[PDB]
Design a protein around this ligand. Structure first.
Ligand SMILES: CCCCCCCCCCCO[C@@H]1O[C@H](CO)[C@@H](O[C@H]2O[C@H](CO)[C@@H](O)[C@H](O)[C@H]2O)[C@H](O)[C@H]1O
Lengths: 431, 49
């Protein structure tokens, strides 16, 4: 009823949900793509896929279990889902995969087949997923030569050069008890899980701490992947944002909610209380846009992504959007701040109070790894309601006004002006 | 008869203009720094279109 957190060597964290009809048990490691290098980039993604390999999944399915794995920038997860009663069967599989097995999943035929699978996977993403590919390039240029610049799926070049040894090296260096948290969500009790874990013994690399490196840094820059054969222009643009556990974490998320998301083809989306919408609908400057406040351990990105077929008016799209951002520093109104509060609460509620145990597992593990605990919506909502117009203006004057930007784009971006023209729009002339 | 005053104004004028000229060069270089150090890479597209 408040999320329990116990440690006996292995940190166990659970979140009991009485309305849930299933249960998820897994392990979340405090290491992701941000802990790789340009040459082993994609190793985590390769691990995810061998864990989700047919051999491993068939074994789990026979037991009535479903496997899930997510590779993020700061973390990595491996979850098993089952009925509330088969919760102990999940632990056995989990125990087996990360303690008993090794040479079973890393066999020549399984590794090569899995490698070939992720290779075609990544190739398709880079070849067809334009909005996400652009967002990945935003991170790449914004944090270039820094941990946060590496794509989570890895790069084709490094992927084709990866061997079983690379996987093992990463596992020995990151899949450690000191860098992990065993999570339990859905319909399960803490005692049931802690005792079932405390039932077994061993340690498997005890006291071993993960590798350390240099911190993430934001660099005003841009990467342009022009492709005149594509039907649209896809653009992502952002300034240095807030890291997780930043004092302005919510103020930044609220600022992003002010401008929000938009889908020109959805009737209700066109009626939102967003001033930018009055400027962009007259000549239909875009098909959609979405503002974000991405937060990581060392840094973050605040900005937006947009897609448009109006290739001759991209300059107006960017101009109007950045002119609106200017407003956060000098003229954002009370009702805009109040509307943002309500919608932010709804966003967080939908994110944290989702009816999915695997989602809760990922969120719970990631947070307890970073701050040792998980913040409740009750506390989050209180912080949000305390945000004032002066807080937004103070934050904007620091993060937005006359600040460097990172830009990424693909498709028909001839109309996207030079860096300086876009950068100049981060402020307004004053007397 | 304007000789003395003309030369005096000339000193003021050349000093201000020389400074403006040097200042403008520096300002120009800054505004162009992004374009000047710009880098391009070519990866021949896959034959399909
Ligand atoms: C015809 C001969 C007449 C020549 C007269 C010379 C004109 C001089 C104009 C000087 C300054 O005009 C001034 O310019 C600076 C930018 O340099 C503007 O600054 C604006 O952009 C800068 C740079 O992104 C921001 O830091 C600043 O917060 C913002 O207000 C300022 O608001 C404006 O008031």
């Amino acid at each position: 009823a408040e999320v329990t957190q116990l440690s006996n060597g292995i940190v166990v964290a659970t979140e009991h949900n009485p309305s849930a009809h299933t249960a998820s048990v897994g392990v979340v490691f405090g290491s992701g793509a941000a802990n790789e290098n340009p040459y082993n980039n994609g190793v985590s993604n390769l691990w995810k896929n061998i864990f989700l390999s047919k051999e491993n999944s068939a074994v789990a399915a026979k037991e009535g279990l479903a496997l899930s794995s997510n590779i993020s920038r700061d973390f990595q997860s491996y979850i098993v889902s089952s009925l509330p009663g088969s919760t102990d069967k999940s632990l056995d599989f989990l125990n087996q995969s990360f303690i008993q097995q090794k040479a079973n999943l890393l066999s020549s035929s399984n590794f090569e087949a899995t490698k070939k699978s992720v290779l075609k996977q990544v190739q398709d993403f880079e070849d067809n997923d334009h909005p996400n590919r652009v967002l990945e390039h935003l991170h790449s240029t914004a944090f270039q030569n820094t941990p946060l610049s590496l794509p989570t799926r890895g790069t084709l070049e490094s992927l084709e050069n990866l061997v079983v040894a690379d996987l093992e090296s990463f596992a020995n260096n990151h899949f450690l008890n000191s860098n992990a948290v065993v999570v339990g969500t859905g319909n399960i009790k803490h005692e049931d899980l802690v005792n079932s874990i405390e039932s077994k013994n061993l340690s498997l690399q005890t006291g071993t701490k993960p590798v350390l490196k240099k911190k993430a840094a934001f660099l005003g820059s841009e990467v342009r992947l022009r492709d005149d054969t594509l039907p649209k222009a896809w653009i992502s643009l952002a300034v240095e944002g807030e890291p997780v556990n930043s004092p302005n974490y919510f103020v930044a998320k609220l600022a992003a909610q002010i401008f929000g998301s938009y889908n020109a083809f959805e009737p209700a989306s066109r009626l939102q209380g967003i001033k930018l919408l009055d400027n962009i609908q007259e000549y239909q400057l875009c098909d959609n846009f979405n503002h974000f406040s991405l937060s990581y351990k060392d840094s973050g990105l605040w900005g937006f992504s947009t897609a448009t077929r109006n290739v001759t008016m991209i300059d107006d799209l960017i101009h109007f959007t950045l002119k609106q951002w200017n407003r956060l520093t000098i003229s954002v109104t009370d009702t805009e701040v109040e509307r943002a509060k309500s919608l932010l609460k709804l966003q967080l509620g939908q994110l944290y109070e989702s009816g999915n145990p695997v989602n809760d597992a990922n969120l719970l593990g990631a947070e307890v790894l970073i701050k040792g605990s998980k913040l409740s919506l009750g506390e989050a909502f209180k912080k949000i309601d305390a945000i004032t117009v002066k807080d937004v203006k103070a934050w904007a004057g620091k993060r937005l006004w006359d600040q460097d930007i990172a830009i990424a784009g693909t498709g028909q971006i001839e109309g996207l002006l030079d860096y300086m023209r876009i950068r100049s729009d981060m402020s307004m002339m004053r007397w | 008869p304007e000789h003395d005053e003309r030369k005096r104004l000339g000193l003021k004028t050349v000093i201000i203009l020389s400074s403006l000229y040097l200042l403008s060069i520096w300002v120009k270089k800054f505004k162009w720094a992004g374009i000047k150090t710009r880098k391009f890479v070519f990866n021949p597209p896959k034959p399909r279109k």
